[PDB]
Amino acid sequence: ACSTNISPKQGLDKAKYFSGKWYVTHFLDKDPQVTDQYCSSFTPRESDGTVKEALYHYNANKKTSFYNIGEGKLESSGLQYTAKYKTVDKKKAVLKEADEKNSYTLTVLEADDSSALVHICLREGSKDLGDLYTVLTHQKDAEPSAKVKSAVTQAGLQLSQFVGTKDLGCQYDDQFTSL
Ligand code: HEM
Ligand SMILES: [N]
Numbered sequence: 125a126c127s128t129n130i131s132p133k134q135g136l137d138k139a140k141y142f143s144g145k146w147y148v149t150h151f152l153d154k155d156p157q158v159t160d161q162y163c164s165s166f167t168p169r170e171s172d173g174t175v176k177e178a179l180y181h182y183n184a185n186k187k188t189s190f191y192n193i194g195e196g197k198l199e200s201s202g203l204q205y206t207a208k209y210k211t212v213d214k215k216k217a218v219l220k221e222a223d224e225k226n227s228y229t230l231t232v233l234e235a236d237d238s239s240a241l242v243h244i245c246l247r248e249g250s251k252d253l254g255d256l257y258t259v260l261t262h263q264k265d266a267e268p269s270a271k272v273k274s275a276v277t278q279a280g281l282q283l284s285q286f287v288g289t290k291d292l293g294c295q296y297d298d299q300f301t302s303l
Contacts, residue, residue: 126245126252130231132202133275140235141203142170145301146260149268150286155254160185161287163294164258167301173198175205178216180300184292191216191300194228203232214300225250233257234275239268241275257281265290 145167161184168177179192191214196207206229208222226248233241240260246253259268259276276283 126229126247126255127243130233130243130245130255132199132204132231133233133235134202136203136232136235138170138198138203140237141232141240142168142175144262145298146240146262147264147266147296148258148289149261149266150259150283150288152257152281152286153254154256157248157253161289161292163289163292163296165264165296165298165301167303170198175207177207178212178301178303179209180297182295184289184294187295189295189297191297193218195222196227203235205230214297216300216303233279234272236269236271238262238266239272241268241272241279243279257286259283259286264294264296 145165148164163182163184166177166179175196175198177194179194182189191212192209193212194207194209196205198205206227208224208227210218210222211220212218228244228246231243233243238261242258244256259272261268
């Protein structure tokens with residue numbers, strides 16, 4: 125199951141996270157449910173205590189993609205939120221409304237002007253799907269900062285064990301993440 129002991133980084137300025145867009149450069153899926161490798165980019169925003177974020181996934185094996193919009197409330201305790209998610213097309217038109225039994229919780233472990241580290245617990249039945257850690261950069265295929273690489277170690281992980289995305293033949297939809 126996903127860890128219940130993940131807490132966001134204390135003192136982090138949320139503006140460093142809710143800004144620009146993010147590309148996943150490295151991911152650690154602690155308990156994968158499928159064997160395909162994904163690329164992902166997303167654009168998180170917040171307003172008045174509610175996060176809305178536009179999400180994109182690209183299956184590098186199968187060459188398929190899908191789009192979502194997550195929505196949830198910013199924890200008063202720190203940079204963390206539990207979101208419900210709709211399925212959308214590449215123009216953000218809704219294909220399916222959220223299934224309220226499913227959620228994900230995102231916890232920000234580090235963020236600076238170039239890079240971030242987050243933990244995501246996706247619950248896509250009624251079941252934690254297991255921990256996913258993603259290293260993020262504002263620019264595609266860029267190098268994460270030293271600070272973010274330190275945060276990986278401090279989360280008890282080893283960067284050597286992450287899957288990098290730079291060599292996967294990723295295709296992104298930058299128009300979508302710029303909406
Ligand atoms: C490279 C990074 C990521 C990988 C490896 C990954 C992996 C996966 C996989 C394997 C699935 C299931 C696909 C299927 O239906 O078979 C999935 C779905 C999903 N992921 Fe990710 N993911 C990544 C990043 C993210 C990010 C950054 C978020 C949220 C901020 C996120 C949220 C979701 C959600 C909401 C779904 C469910 C989509 C739906 O059923 O409509 N994922 N992801
Ligand atoms: N995910």
